[PDB]
Sequence to fold (1418 residues):
Amino acid sequence: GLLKKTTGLVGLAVCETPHERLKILYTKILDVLGHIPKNAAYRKYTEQITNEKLSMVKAEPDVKKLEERLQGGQIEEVILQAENELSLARKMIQWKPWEPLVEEPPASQWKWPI
Amino acid sequence: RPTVRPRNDVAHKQLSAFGEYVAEILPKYVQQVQVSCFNELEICIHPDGVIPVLTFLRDHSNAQFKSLADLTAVDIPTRQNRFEIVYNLLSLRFNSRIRVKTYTDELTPIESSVPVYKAANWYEREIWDMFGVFFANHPDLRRILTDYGFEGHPFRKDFPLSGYVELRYDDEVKRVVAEPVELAQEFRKFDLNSPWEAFPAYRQPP
Amino acid sequence: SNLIEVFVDGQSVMVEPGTTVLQACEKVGMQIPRFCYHERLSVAGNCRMCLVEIEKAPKVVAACAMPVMKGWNILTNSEKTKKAREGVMEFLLANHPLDCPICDQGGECDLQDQSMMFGSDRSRFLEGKRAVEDKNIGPLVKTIMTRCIQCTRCIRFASEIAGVDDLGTTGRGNDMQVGTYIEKMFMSELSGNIIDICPVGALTSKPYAFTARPWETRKTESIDVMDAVGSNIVVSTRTGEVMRILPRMHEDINEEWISDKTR
Amino acid sequence: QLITVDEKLDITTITGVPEEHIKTRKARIFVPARNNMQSGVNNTKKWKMEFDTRERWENPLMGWASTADPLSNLVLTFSTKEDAVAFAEKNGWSYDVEERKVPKPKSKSYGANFSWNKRTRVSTK
Amino acid sequence: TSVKPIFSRDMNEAKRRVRELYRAWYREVPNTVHLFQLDISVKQGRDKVREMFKKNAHITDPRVVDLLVIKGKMELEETIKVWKQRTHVMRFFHETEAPRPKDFLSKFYVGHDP
Amino acid sequence: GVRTSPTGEKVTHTGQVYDDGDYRKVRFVGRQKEVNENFAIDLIAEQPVSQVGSRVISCDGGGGALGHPRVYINLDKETKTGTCGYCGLQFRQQH
Amino acid sequence: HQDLPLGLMDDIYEFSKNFSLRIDELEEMLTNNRIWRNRTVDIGIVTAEDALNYGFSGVMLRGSGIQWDLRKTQPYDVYDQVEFDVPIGSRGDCYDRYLCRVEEMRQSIRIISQCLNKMPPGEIKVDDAKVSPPKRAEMKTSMESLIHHFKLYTEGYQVPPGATYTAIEAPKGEFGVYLVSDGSSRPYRCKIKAPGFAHLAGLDKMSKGHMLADVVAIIGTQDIVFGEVDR
Amino acid sequence: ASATRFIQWLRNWASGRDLQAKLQLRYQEISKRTQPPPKLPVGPSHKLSNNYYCTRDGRREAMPPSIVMSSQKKAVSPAPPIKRWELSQDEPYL
Amino acid sequence: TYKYVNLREPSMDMKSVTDRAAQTLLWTELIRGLGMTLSYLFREPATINYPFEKGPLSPRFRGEHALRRYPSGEERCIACKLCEAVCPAQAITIEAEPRADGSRRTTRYDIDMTKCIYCGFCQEACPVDAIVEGPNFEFSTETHEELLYNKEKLLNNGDKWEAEIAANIQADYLYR
Ligand SMILES: CCCCCCCCCCCCCCCCCC(=O)OC[C@H](COP(=O)(O)OCCN)OC(=O)CCCCCCCCCCCCCCCCC
Ligand code: SF4
Ligand code: SF4
Ligand code: SF4
Ligand code: SF4
Ligand code: FES
Ligand SMILES: [K+]
Ligand SMILES: [Zn+2]
Fold:
């Protein structure tokens, strides 16, 4: 399991400890998700995919074989996606998009052709 | 069948499933979801949901729509909210496209999506320029395509094709001047629509 | 109470007894293609463009003439209906002349438009075509009778609306010809309306000949002042010039006719 | 947070239209009449808004039709007359509304062509 | 009849912005006349500014007022940053346009328009 | 078939000519009025009537796909000739 | 509109056979020239994340290492039947984008070679005369063909109502149209997505920390034509 | 093609290539400017039977969009994740 | 499938380092660039001797418009207005009436050559090969007005160029 010299994507640094970084990030996500109601679809779906990713990380110490399991590109791309999810989860708490529809559209709003 | 475009049921089902997925996760904002017969997915949302919905699609691990392909408006004068705001997004991770649509009128601001996509900057300036839709919290909202001091929003359906003013150089004042438009040959309007219906599948109820 | 229930492509509609299949379809916004049928003339049933399948009935019915029965499901878009329309259109065009560029009907022709919408997109007619000699019926209506499709609208209008029994059909079969038989002028104060109701360019306005195409005209809805009836009209103009006058439907005044002076 | 506005919607000041082409124009709101040359009715489904016709003159060089009317070609389409009226009102145009003319239901009977004692009997087919 | 505001929640707040915009325009005219080397006087430029404001004095919708101020600020920015050229500034004055007659008789003699 | 007016201006095949008081003829001063002198109405009239042995004849203008759409001309009347609506050639049923 | 004239394919082959040498001469002047490298290396660096979020496409993406090309990922007419390589940069700078474009020319010749060999017989427009006009010989003999010719060149074909965003890998990047049909024969709306619009919007970002003469290089590396930016 | 042997040698040496094999000026290898007439084939719809337009009418098979939700379980992605590209074997590196 | 355009490690052995120092100090790559421009000096140029020589064109070339006749001299145009309808630029203006002999013919046929986009759609639309784009491309003028063609100008163009137009049509009509 040698460390790669480059991710090949400009600005995306190589990560020396991908497994620790991912375990920390996925655990953080599940922590933030605990603050969302239990019946919110965002929580149920995000907890489900996050847990599957966390199980893969724990079941594969080889980085290249882990990358193939996750199907998310470079492990550093997978870490970046995890950071994006963690940032999204914190925004979702303020937005609360699991609440009912704010307002129906006018009668013919989405009718095409007129 | 050589002349007929082949259907793709597999992609139609996948996009339909993802459309429900989005609607279930953001019920607060999603008003309608549909998949066209050529397999394009459209999410119709309340305008309040521009930032939450676009952020979700950009950042969620099962979406990852990292690229804003295009952002534009359509003017439909018969609608109370005449302007339809269309976001076209691309996900490289899942090799997919999605279209997000909302609406506004002439006096209701839309939230600028520059925080979600830096690409939105100029697209929203163009929408303001051509349609007159105001975007709130834009870093620098001003005309982009029309002349300086140009009055009106040309892409509105009630703006005349040739405009109201035209330019020429006037020797007396030694500068280019703007004057009301007169055309040596008026644009010739054609009435092309056949009085016979073409597409039964889209007939509207009486 | 009196109304009976029928179905148009599965959509229930309540219609009065005596309503034809074609009228039932028009209740749900479906216009059946037609040539010989005109709602202000007596029913003829000869062009056969209106043939439509009735569900669970092996034979297509002429929708313009067939009274609708209770519980019928009219399939206006079935494969059987479409093939019936394609076949009839094919027969209509087999002897029709390749005249569209020189024919004043071009651009507002029901034969052209229903060929586009309901017919096939090509020909398999490998023979020579019929050619018919032209009739002289006065200074207002030009006849190019090779374009006639024998719909008999003009005959029915002349007999029933104008009360003039001068137009008819002579001969038989493929050689059947619409005209006056003898040299004779169709001078009636309503004669010019046969230009409008002729679906093809067989009867055309002589004064209007060759001067304009329909797509380039501007339509100004207006009123006639040649008498005190107040007939509603459309003034066609192009590039600042009046080009012709057309009837504008008004049920309580002129219906869809105008007098020759108005025209 | 929403606010309350009771003013009649008026956007004439923010559309950029020259004042002449608001105050002096007369919009016509109507359903187009069927072209009498054809039986198709598909062009009579929607409402239209057009403006009053103004001068066209002959171009001295070529004889082409010249115009100084920027709205000479403007024709707008609406689902209902209420939508058309609402659009006209907020844009400051005075308008005329013509009620839609719909052909009345006719009573047709092929059998009447052969009546035993009525004038509807036809002399030819 | 409950609507999303632009900037102003009512006419009083809207009219504050109008006054602020007018002050900015009023102070900018002398610089504009000098910078664009205009042949009009500072008084003419300010008389034109007042005329442009005055024609919108009948507006009572705070959202319309906000848009007018927004558009007025854009026009002021184009002038201060000299994105406009001399031709653009002078278009407000219609120097080459002949006097359009107003009374009924004058319009009757020249053409058909009202 | 070019004819000239009293003022001297050539008359076109569409009958156009500026009348005596028309200022617009100033455009030709020092230049010229472009007029095509091969009047098609006079040229087609020189073509002989074609004698045929059938009631119906077809014309495509000559040259197959290089001509005009093929039309069929009825020749039952003996008072006049059958004229092609596209190219103006005339036909007559012999005997 | 028309089939290839006889003999054209031979001349395209003759042109293609010699063209890679012309690229070689272009590379001899620029690729290793220290002055050219000084003007382009480490100029206008864009990171992969910034490129995506700023709406870049084409070489503006691949120069920064992103593995994306619509001919491969979302293929059209027959791009799935030809073989070629996508050039990818590593530095995200003007020099890498120059190299990507030069290599894409080589791959274009490689594709052209395959198109010449696999060109099939048959008609060149849809055999459906309610969309594509009939052949002139048919228009001048058959009634149906003449009607359809007349109608196709006056009214045009009606397009069923709907909206599509369609894009291709144009030479400058992703070029798309958001086309809205109202059912008639005229489009209701046609928004043109021009790749150079987003690219030029990123000039200020890319010009950070560079000198005036580098702005010329960065504008060039974006490949900007104002016909499509301004529309 | 008219260059002398010396001048051909000089420019081949300066460029480093066999320029004469791939001249950028065209000579007789180009196709004749007069060609025999073509005879183009016809498409699949050129048949005299079994050819009803309603069986090949693509425009009329278009349908309005399917409304999957209107304001009136495993997570899914819009499509399966994209497959990693493979490095070219023709020439992986320049 | 993809390739890397610029992903290579320079060799850091003494021979390779000294190779790059010699390139830096002796300007070898710049001298190699001088070699290529030197070889072009001794190539035959590609310039043609216009107007004595002309660039090659094909029968399909879209140039100056002309109105054509039948062999009898009758005009082909029967005022169908298909060309006017299709013209993307609205460059064509047509009026028509019955001719004195009853023929359907134009009284006006104008092409504004400064509106025209030389797209050829008119000659595709024409059912009788009446309006064509001819082979002439050398018709620049000193005034704007000279480029506003009326029917007399276009008929004169047809009579002027018919010899070449017919031959060009003869070469391409089987592709149409
Ligand atoms: C025994 C004891 C002896 C002791 C003495 C021994 C001395 C011999 C060994 C030393 C050799 C010295 C070479 C002197 C030439 C100057 C060398 C030089 O300066 O080259 C470096 C210069 C910049 O190099 P650069 O790639 O930018 O990177 C360096 C910065 N990091 O790169 C450049 O300058 C490039 C030049 C740019 C201009 C290009 C246009 C000119 C190209 C054509 C020139 C043709 C040759 C000129 C011949 C003139 C003849 C009159
Ligand atoms: S009647 Fe219609 S189909 Fe027949 S020639 Fe005239 S335009 Fe063409
Ligand atoms: S002349 Fe016209 S209306 Fe009369 S039968 Fe013939 S096609 Fe019908
Ligand atoms: S070439 Fe094109 S633009 Fe010019 S007249 Fe013909 S159709 Fe119109
Ligand atoms: S040039 Fe051809 S298409 Fe144009 S009006 Fe004349 S005949 Fe018709
Ligand atoms: S419309 Fe029914 S048979 Fe003619
Ligand atoms: K008619
Ligand atoms: Zn002929």
Observations:
- The longest helix of chain I spans residues 151-172.
- The longest strand of chain I covers residues 104-112.
- The beta strands of chain I are 2-4, 65-67, 92-98, 104-112, 131-133, 148-149.
- The radius of gyration of chain I is 29 Å.
